[PDB]
Design a protein around this ligand. Structure first.
Ligand code: GNP
Ligand code: MG
Length: 166
């Protein structure tokens, strides 16, 4: 079976884990539980292909940046997550993307841009701004809510679609 190696990155608190746990476990983690590095595996069907998703859920914290340089090397594709209610997380995307391109030594790494927490009324990042950013990177954009599960599969599965195309 094809194994797709997905890495979830971005600022602390954006919902990297909630996205991942919503995908793998079908449960929304309401809790505060900062990550160091966690890994997940789950068989899924994507466009009719039964495949395995290996997900590496990374810390958002700066403290673990050097840990990200090492353990993201074997990622095949990256979810760059921000929260639509947190403009700083959106600004920080640039730095996570650059790190990934460094780690893979490539300007064209399979990647998606993910605007999470779409369930929240207090949006500070307009959808068109993020769409535009994703266009400027040549990557897909997905809006999600880890809380309601909206877009959760779309975010991971669209990344798998990116991997397949590279
Ligand atoms: N309303 C709402 N809350 C969310 C969503 N995603 C995550 N959260 C909440 O935001 C907080 C942080 O989420 P978490 O998944 O821990 O973020 P992270 O990006 O994995 N944090 P870290 O970088 O420390 O590992 C948690 O209380 C979580 O329930 C969402 O889509 N909607
Ligand atoms: Mg986490």
């Amino acid at each position: 079976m094809t194994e797709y190696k997905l890495v979830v990155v971005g600022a602390g608190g954006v919902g990297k884990s909630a996205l991942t746990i919503q995908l793998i476990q079908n449960h929304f983690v309401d809790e505060y539980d900062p990550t160091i590095e966690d890994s997940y595996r789950k068989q899924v069907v994507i466009d009719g292909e039964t495949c395995l998703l290996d997900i590496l859920d990374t810390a958002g914290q700066e403290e673990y940046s050097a840990m990200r340089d090492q353990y993201m090397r074997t990622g095949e594709g990256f979810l760059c997550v921000f929260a639509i209610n947190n403009t700083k997380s959106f600004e920080d995307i640039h730095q996570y993307r650059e790190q990934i391109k460094r780690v893979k030594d490539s300007d064209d790494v399979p990647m998606v841009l993910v605007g999470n927490k779409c369930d929240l009324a207090a949006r500070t990042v307009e959808s068109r701004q993020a769409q535009d950013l994703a266009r400027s990177y040549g990557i897909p954009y997905i809006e999600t809510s880890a809380k309601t599960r909206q877009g959760v599969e779309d975010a991971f599965y669209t990344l798998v679609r990116e991997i397949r195309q590279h």
